[PDB]
Design a protein around this motif. Structure first.
Motif, mmCIF file in Angstrom:
data_model
loop_
_atom_site.group_PDB
_atom_site.id
_atom_site.type_symbol
_atom_site.label_atom_id
_atom_site.label_comp_id
_atom_site.label_asym_id
_atom_site.label_seq_id
_atom_site.Cartn_x
_atom_site.Cartn_y
_atom_site.Cartn_z
ATOM 1 N N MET B 96 0.826 -1.208 0.000
ATOM 2 C CA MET B 96 0.000 0.000 0.000
ATOM 3 C C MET B 96 0.860 1.257 0.000
ATOM 4 N N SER B 97 1.953 1.253 0.772
ATOM 5 C CA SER B 97 2.840 2.413 0.831
ATOM 6 C C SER B 97 3.493 2.693 -0.522
ATOM 7 N N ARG B 100 0.917 4.190 -2.883
ATOM 8 C CA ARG B 100 0.741 5.623 -2.661
ATOM 9 C C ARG B 100 1.865 6.428 -3.312
ATOM 10 N N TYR B 101 3.115 5.981 -3.149
ATOM 11 C CA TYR B 101 4.246 6.647 -3.790
ATOM 12 C C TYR B 101 4.086 6.652 -5.305
ATOM 13 N N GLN B 103 1.331 6.332 -6.884
ATOM 14 C CA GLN B 103 0.018 6.898 -7.201
ATOM 15 C C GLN B 103 -0.796 5.933 -8.069
ATOM 16 N N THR B 105 -4.137 4.143 -7.661
ATOM 17 C CA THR B 105 -5.324 4.069 -6.816
ATOM 18 C C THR B 105 -5.960 2.683 -6.853
ATOM 19 N N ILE B 108 -4.105 0.644 -4.309
ATOM 20 C CA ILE B 108 -4.509 1.104 -2.973
ATOM 21 C C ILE B 108 -5.846 0.491 -2.590
ATOM 22 N N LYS B 112 -6.783 -1.989 0.634
ATOM 23 C CA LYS B 112 -7.796 -1.660 1.637
ATOM 24 C C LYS B 112 -8.846 -2.760 1.750
#
Lengths: 122, 120
Positions: B96-97, B100-101, B103, B105, B108, B112
């Motif tokens: 997940m990290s 995010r870096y 980008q 989605t 991500i 989740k």
């Protein structure tokens, strides 16, 4: 499946916008821009044409065809980048012939199904 | 959509064989070969990185990352080329990290959902 559909929609947008287009195809004087990696994946003909320089980057590869029409190549390349192939009795024989030349067995299969379905009229 | 599945399977085979790979990614001393057009389509970070030269051919573009591990980037790139993200309790937060870096989605969201369903 949504991953695959979105990704191909993005590649279609890229080729319409001339992004990363390392292959040019000229048919009936009309220029088409596309990606070598997608064409190699999609066509036995382009596998043979593009294999020699598959590890070289530089000039785009320009291929010319006069064995099918620009309208026919439009339909084939639209399918390559979308999975949709709009067919009618007016163009399915020409598309199938071009698909044989380009060695695209999936397009050939779509054409044969369309013909069989279309002939069941009564 | 069998055309879509076959196409991406072929692109995965190409990057594994270093065919038409105009992007090199170096993560934790490890080299990854991939296609700019696929990466530009799949990651807001790569979209920004590759926009400057998107009509220029020649040398592959080389990107380097030290904010995530090679194992984590392996998982993400495998997802890019297959639609399947290999998650476990061990790696889901690391993936997940990195997403995010980069980008991403979609990645991500998958992370989740993995955490949310972990109680079921």
């Amino acid at each position: 499946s949504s991953h695959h559909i979105r990704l191909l929609q993005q590649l279609d947008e890229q080729r319409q916008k001339d992004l990363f287009c390392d292959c040019h195809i000229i048919v009936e004087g009309q220029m088409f821009k596309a990606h070598r990696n997608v064409l190699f994946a999609s066509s036995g003909y382009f596998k043979m044409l593009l294999s020699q320089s598959c590890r070289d980057m530089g000039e785009p590869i320009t291929a010319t065809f006069d064995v099918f029409s620009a309208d026919t190549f439009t339909a084939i390349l639209d399918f390559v980048y979308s999975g949709k192939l709009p067919l009618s009795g007016q163009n399915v024989i020409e598309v199938m012939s071009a698909a044989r030349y380009l060695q695209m067995t999936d397009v050939i299969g779509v054409c044969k199904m369309f013909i069989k379905s279309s002939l069941d009229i009564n």
